[PDB]
A paper describes a structure:
The anti-apoptotic (pro-survival) proteins of the BCL-2 family include BCL-2, BCL-XL, MCL-1, BCL-w and BFL-1/A1. These proteins bind to and sequester the apoptosis effectors, as well as the apoptosis sensitizers, BIM, BID, PUMA, NOXA, BAD, BMF, HRK and BIK5,6.
Therefore, we measured the binding affinities of cp1 to both BCL-2 and BCL-XL using a SPR assay. The results indicate that cp1 has a much higher binding affinity to BCL-2 (0.65 ± 0.14 μM) than to BCL-XL (>12 μM), implying an over 19-fold selectivity of cp1 for these two highly similar BCL-2 family proteins. In both structures, the electron densities for cp1 were well defined. It is noteworthy that the main-chain N atom of cp1-G6 forms a hydrogen bond with the carboxyl group of D111 in BCL-2. Therefore, we speculate that the D111/A104 discrepancy between BCL-2 and BCL-XL may be mainly responsible for the selectivity of cp1, while the M115/L108 pair is perhaps not as crucial as the former one. To test the essentiality of D111, we generated a BCL-2 D111A mutant and measured its binding affinity to cp1 also using SPR. This mutant showed a clearly lower cp1-binding affinity (5.34 ± 1.00 µM) than wild-type (WT) BCL-2 (0.65 ± 0.14 μM), yet comparable to BCL-XL (>12 µM).
Numbering used by the authors:
A (entry chain B): 1 to 11
B (entry chain A): 7 to 28, 88 to 203
Amino acid sequence: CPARYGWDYEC
Amino acid sequence: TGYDNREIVMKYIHYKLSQRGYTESEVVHLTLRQAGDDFERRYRRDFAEMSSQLHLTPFTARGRFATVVEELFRDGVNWGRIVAFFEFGGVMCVESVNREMSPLVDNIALWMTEYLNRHLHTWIQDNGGWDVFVELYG
């Protein structure tokens, strides 16, 4: 998904 | 696996409530506890902004929960958003017991398993199952 949260970067 | 999902939620919420001082699936349970811990310590500020989105009272309907968590999964599911979802629920429960509204904990635990079962398990079964979560996070 588009990164909207700092945790999206680890996925 | 609605039975397993309700169990996963209850184990995580029980773990979280006891931590804040208020053979089958065991490895998924352990992984999820660890993941929630890592998440809350790493994303303190970002998690505070998510939690501030919603305060459950005896008035609150599942809809209001559904809308705040929909936004978390608006443009998809990743394991990090699922961990955010579990920590979110945890925070709601801790806020509930902190303000002497302990009966909301069972309400929140049901809301979480229903959102798991309806919106998330579908994604999980196309993304490697809980076994994949365990190898990523356990």
